[PDB]
Design a protein around this motif. Structure first.
Motif, PDB file in Angstrom:
ATOM      1  N   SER A  51       0.839  -1.191   0.000  1.00 26.54           N
ATOM      2  CA  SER A  51       0.000   0.000   0.000  1.00 26.54           C
ATOM      3  C   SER A  51       0.880   1.249   0.000  1.00 26.54           C
ATOM      4  O   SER A  51       2.071   1.190  -0.320  1.00 26.54           O
ATOM      5  N   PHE A  52       0.267   2.401   0.277  1.00 27.88           N
ATOM      6  CA  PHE A  52       1.045   3.598   0.575  1.00 27.88           C
ATOM      7  C   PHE A  52       1.965   3.323   1.763  1.00 27.88           C
ATOM      8  O   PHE A  52       1.587   2.648   2.725  1.00 27.88           O
ATOM      9  N   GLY A  53       3.193   3.835   1.690  1.00 23.82           N
ATOM     10  CA  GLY A  53       4.194   3.567   2.705  1.00 23.82           C
ATOM     11  C   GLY A  53       5.078   2.370   2.421  1.00 23.82           C
ATOM     12  O   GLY A  53       6.183   2.284   2.980  1.00 23.82           O
ATOM     13  N   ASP A  54       4.602   1.440   1.590  1.00 26.72           N
ATOM     14  CA  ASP A  54       5.375   0.359   0.986  1.00 26.72           C
ATOM     15  C   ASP A  54       5.715  -0.768   1.974  1.00 26.72           C
ATOM     16  O   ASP A  54       6.581  -1.611   1.693  1.00 26.72           O
ATOM     17  N   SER A  55       5.010  -0.825   3.101  1.00 25.41           N
ATOM     18  CA  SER A  55       5.146  -1.903   4.070  1.00 25.41           C
ATOM     19  C   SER A  55       4.468  -3.174   3.574  1.00 25.41           C
ATOM     20  O   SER A  55       3.327  -3.119   3.103  1.00 25.41           O
ATOM     21  N   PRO A  56       5.128  -4.335   3.643  1.00 22.54           N
ATOM     22  CA  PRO A  56       4.462  -5.611   3.365  1.00 22.54           C
ATOM     23  C   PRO A  56       3.691  -6.188   4.546  1.00 22.54           C
ATOM     24  O   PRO A  56       3.080  -7.250   4.401  1.00 22.54           O
ATOM     25  N   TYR A  57       3.702  -5.532   5.706  1.00 25.11           N
ATOM     26  CA  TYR A  57       2.948  -5.966   6.874  1.00 25.11           C
ATOM     27  C   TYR A  57       1.605  -5.230   7.008  1.00 25.11           C
ATOM     28  O   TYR A  57       1.022  -5.197   8.106  1.00 25.11           O
ATOM     29  N   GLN A  58       1.136  -4.597   5.915  1.00 26.17           N
ATOM     30  CA  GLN A  58      -0.166  -3.924   5.816  1.00 26.17           C
ATOM     31  C   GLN A  58      -0.657  -4.121   4.376  1.00 26.17           C
ATOM     32  O   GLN A  58      -0.545  -3.234   3.525  1.00 26.17           O
ATOM     33  N   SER A  59      -1.300  -5.262   4.127  1.00 22.84           N
ATOM     34  CA  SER A  59      -1.386  -5.814   2.781  1.00 22.84           C
ATOM     35  C   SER A  59      -2.821  -6.019   2.345  1.00 22.84           C
ATOM     36  O   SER A  59      -3.671  -6.412   3.147  1.00 22.84           O
ATOM     37  N   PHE A  60      -3.063  -5.786   1.054  1.00 21.47           N
ATOM     38  CA  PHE A  60      -4.364  -6.035   0.454  1.00 21.47           C
ATOM     39  C   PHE A  60      -4.807  -7.485   0.607  1.00 21.47           C
ATOM     40  O   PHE A  60      -6.008  -7.762   0.527  1.00 21.47           O
ATOM     41  N   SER A  61      -3.879  -8.424   0.804  1.00 18.65           N
ATOM     42  CA  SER A  61      -4.256  -9.820   1.012  1.00 18.65           C
ATOM     43  C   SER A  61      -3.125 -10.540   1.719  1.00 18.65           C
ATOM     44  O   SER A  61      -1.951 -10.203   1.550  1.00 18.65           O
ATOM     45  N   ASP A  99      12.283   3.654  -5.668  1.00 17.08           N
ATOM     46  CA  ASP A  99      11.278   4.711  -5.689  1.00 17.08           C
ATOM     47  C   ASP A  99       9.935   4.034  -5.980  1.00 17.08           C
ATOM     48  O   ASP A  99       9.581   3.785  -7.138  1.00 17.08           O
ATOM     49  N   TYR A 100       9.199   3.710  -4.905  1.00 20.56           N
ATOM     50  CA  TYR A 100       7.889   3.087  -5.061  1.00 20.56           C
ATOM     51  C   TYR A 100       6.877   4.073  -5.617  1.00 20.56           C
ATOM     52  O   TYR A 100       5.911   3.663  -6.272  1.00 20.56           O
ATOM     53  N   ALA A 101       7.074   5.368  -5.348  1.00 17.99           N
ATOM     54  CA  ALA A 101       6.230   6.422  -5.898  1.00 17.99           C
ATOM     55  C   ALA A 101       6.319   6.395  -7.419  1.00 17.99           C
ATOM     56  O   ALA A 101       7.357   6.741  -7.998  1.00 17.99           O
ATOM     57  N   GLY A 102       5.249   5.967  -8.078  1.00 20.49           N
ATOM     58  CA  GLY A 102       5.280   5.899  -9.520  1.00 20.49           C
ATOM     59  C   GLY A 102       5.967   4.691 -10.120  1.00 20.49           C
ATOM     60  O   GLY A 102       6.132   4.641 -11.342  1.00 20.49           O
ATOM     61  N   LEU A 103       6.379   3.710  -9.324  1.00 18.73           N
ATOM     62  CA  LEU A 103       6.855   2.475  -9.942  1.00 18.73           C
ATOM     63  C   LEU A 103       5.688   1.554 -10.293  1.00 18.73           C
ATOM     64  O   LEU A 103       5.728   0.835 -11.305  1.00 18.73           O
ATOM     65  N   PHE A 104       4.645   1.560  -9.454  1.00 15.97           N
ATOM     66  CA  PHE A 104       3.378   0.953  -9.846  1.00 15.97           C
ATOM     67  C   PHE A 104       2.828   1.640 -11.082  1.00 15.97           C
ATOM     68  O   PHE A 104       2.219   0.996 -11.944  1.00 15.97           O
ATOM     69  N   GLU A 105       3.023   2.957 -11.170  1.00 20.38           N
ATOM     70  CA  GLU A 105       2.721   3.690 -12.393  1.00 20.38           C
ATOM     71  C   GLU A 105       3.409   3.051 -13.598  1.00 20.38           C
ATOM     72  O   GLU A 105       2.754   2.698 -14.588  1.00 20.38           O
ATOM     73  N   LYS A 106       4.728   2.851 -13.516  1.00 19.51           N
ATOM     74  CA  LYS A 106       5.494   2.521 -14.710  1.00 19.51           C
ATOM     75  C   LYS A 106       5.443   1.045 -15.090  1.00 19.51           C
ATOM     76  O   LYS A 106       5.712   0.716 -16.250  1.00 19.51           O
TER      77      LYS A 106
END
Ligand SMILES: C[C@H]1O[C@H](O[C@H]2[C@H](O)[C@@H](O)[C@@H](O)O[C@@H]2CO)[C@H](O)[C@@H](O)[C@@H]1N[C@H]1C=C(CO)[C@@H](O)[C@H](O)[C@H]1O
Ligand SMILES: C[C@H]1O[C@H](O[C@H]2[C@H](O)[C@@H](O)CO[C@@H]2CO)[C@H](O)[C@@H](O)[C@@H]1N[C@H]1C=C(CO)[C@@H](O)[C@H](O)[C@H]1O
Length: 496
Positions: A51-61, A99-106
């Motif tokens: 999610s925002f913040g890029d933590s894997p311990y707060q996950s969509f699933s 840089d997670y900001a905009g890597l999901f973008e790219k």
């Protein structure tokens, strides 16, 4: 019992040209390097979605694969994309910072091109469905991600259509028909994840390298589980958390931690025979070779911040039914390769939990020199065999950083205790001592093996700025670093 050692490096910290480590060539090179140095274990972070913040311990699933780790090169070699699709599509300025900001973008045009080409293959659907039959959770996570994207990547609690928020079957049949192609996208990306990941795990296993996976205790409130299975949590009619998760202040910093995850209605679990937890653990022991359950304290007594909080100290210690859960897991699953992360807030309920499981627990040597008396339970001379010893973990400072923030009496004492030779970087000092301990397994933080400075810390708990961003330059894995690791592994009898 047979001694061994391993390296702590998340898939994200691998190097590459995609802006983030991948299940790609450099992962196989990392395995190759682990067998060079006669390591036993590769510990990674969780492979879940972020999610925002890029933590894997707060996950969509709790099971879905973080799609950022899919390798474009492995995908090109499959006939799905070409490389005039991602050659010079630069993901990030600095190699050793993601840089997670905009890597999901790219990544998205590229992944979409690959999924479009995968579906047009003639056997496509009978491979994808043969996949969904072994991972049956996929499709409703894929619908969760599709609905999330429709509403503009907004949290589940703030979607606009209350019918879809509580899955009224007419609204559901409307959304799965209205969005069937973006759903199939997420199914196929999960198929990619698992295909590539299990290829990597098979390479690793057949070279004698075993994977320690991480299982986050909690999921995020923005989750396919809060959506499809709300009866596991303390939530209300519009699915917002009654209480959230965290941890109170201890004796070395006064404000504590606020996490944000929903809280478990552990009563529904006890009644339901812990069905969901058996499923989590089962898919964990298939995803990995050794499962590391985070925040073991949470299975004896968890901290429960209420709503209307102002800081995280506005909570209580609630009881979870640890003993029953783990007896049920033992009975239904057999005994299993679990290691328990039992740092902090230890009381005799937690120590009974551990003794009853017989799992190894942790020893973080960085917590064990703040008291120059030698009485800290994290000081090397108090370790026993049934523990996994770290210099630090991904939430602690790098050793070079920990050594700055010491009382010069604490520094003096630590240089005494560990016998630091003059003209010697203290990461090699600390790691010599760590490997000399009676612990059955010791894990070395790839940061400290390369002697990296305080900047290189992976997490710093209870912040969001600049976390999970460390990557490692291939330039820094000099033959000398590798020779050092092999040496400490041979001298202290922890090879292969
Ligand atoms: C990691 C841990 O450090 C601090 O707590 C205590 C030590 O863990 C104890 O062994 C003993 O030395 O007392 C310390 C207090 O000064 C800190 O206060 C804890 O909050 C912290 N643990 C939290 C962080 C985690 C990150 O993994 C969680 O795993 C853990 O469950 C949290 O409690
Ligand atoms: C999501 C949180 O992850 C981390 O806590 C981990 C811990 O590091 C693990 O060892 C064990 O699990 C817990 C979580 O299960 C971070 O330390 C923590 O800071 C993370 N939460 C951050 C994200 C948000 C987004 O809302 C904030 O609400 C939260 O306060 C922030 O800290």
């Amino acid at each position: 019992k047979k001694r061994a050692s391993g390296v702590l490096m998340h898939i994200t910290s691998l190097p590459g040209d995609l802006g983030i480590g991948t299940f790609g060539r450099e992962a196989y090179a990392f395995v190759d390097f682990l067998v060079e140095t006669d390591q036993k274990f590769w510990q990674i972070l969780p492979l879940t979605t972020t999610s925002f913040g890029d933590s894997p311990y707060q996950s969509f699933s709790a099971v879905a694969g973080n799609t950022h780790l899919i390798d474009f090169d492995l995908l090109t070699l499959e006939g799905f994309i070409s490389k005039d699709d991602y050659q010079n599509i630069s993901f990030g300025q600095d190699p050793e910072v993601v840089d997670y900001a905009g890597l999901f973008e790219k990544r998205r045009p590229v992944l979409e091109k690959a999924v479009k080409n995968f579906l047009k293959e003639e056997r496509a659907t009978r491979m994808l469905s043969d996949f969904l039959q072994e991972e049956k959770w996929v499709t409703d996570f894929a619908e969760f991600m599709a609905i999330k994207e429709h509403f503009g990547n907004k949290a589940l609690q703030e979607w606009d259509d209350k019918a879809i928020i509580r899955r009224e079957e007419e609204a559901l049949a409307g959304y799965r028909q209205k969005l069937s192609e973006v759903i199939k996208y997420h199914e196929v990306t999960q198929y990619f994840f698992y295909k590539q990941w299990f290829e990597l795990k098979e390479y690793a296993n057949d070279k004698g390298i075993q994977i320690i996976g991480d299982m986050p205790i909690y999921v995020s409130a923005d989750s396919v589980e809060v959506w499809t299975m709300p009866e596991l949590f303390k939530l209300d009619r519009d699915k917002q958390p009654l209480a959230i998760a965290g941890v109170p202040a201890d004796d070395f910093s006064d404000d504590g931690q606020l996490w944000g995850n929903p809280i478990y209605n552990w009563d529904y679990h006890k009644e339901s025979d812990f069905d969901w937890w058996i499923y989590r653990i089962q898919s964990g022991v298939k995803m990995y070779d050794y499962l590391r359950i985070d925040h073991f304290k949470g299975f004896s007594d968890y901290w429960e911040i209420r709503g209307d909080y102002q800081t995280a100290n506005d909570g209580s210690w609630q009881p979870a039914p640890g003993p029953e859960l783990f007896a049920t897991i033992k009975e239904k699953l057999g005994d299993l390769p679990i290691i328990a992360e039992n740092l902090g807030y230890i009381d005799e309920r937690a120590e009974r939990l551990l003794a009853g499981t017989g799992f190894p627990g942790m020893k973080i040597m960085e917590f064990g020199f703040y008291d120059t008396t030698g009485n800290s339970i994290d000081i090397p001379h108090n370790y026993t065999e049934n523990t996994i010893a770290y210099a630090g973990t991904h939430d602690n400072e790098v050793i070079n950083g920990w050594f700055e923030n010491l009382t010069v009496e604490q520094k003096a004492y630590a240089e005494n205790y560990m016998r630091r030779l003059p003209n010697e970087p203290i990461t090699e000092t600390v790691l010599r001592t760590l490997y000399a301990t009676v612990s059955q397994t010791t894990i070395t933080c790839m940061q400290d093996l390369l002697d990296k400075p305080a900047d290189s810390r992976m997490n710093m708990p209870n912040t969001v700025g600049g976390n999970w961003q460390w990557r490692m330059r291939k330039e820094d894995l000099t033959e000398n670093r590798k020779a050092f690791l092999k040496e400490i592994t041979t001298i202290y009898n922890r090879g292969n």
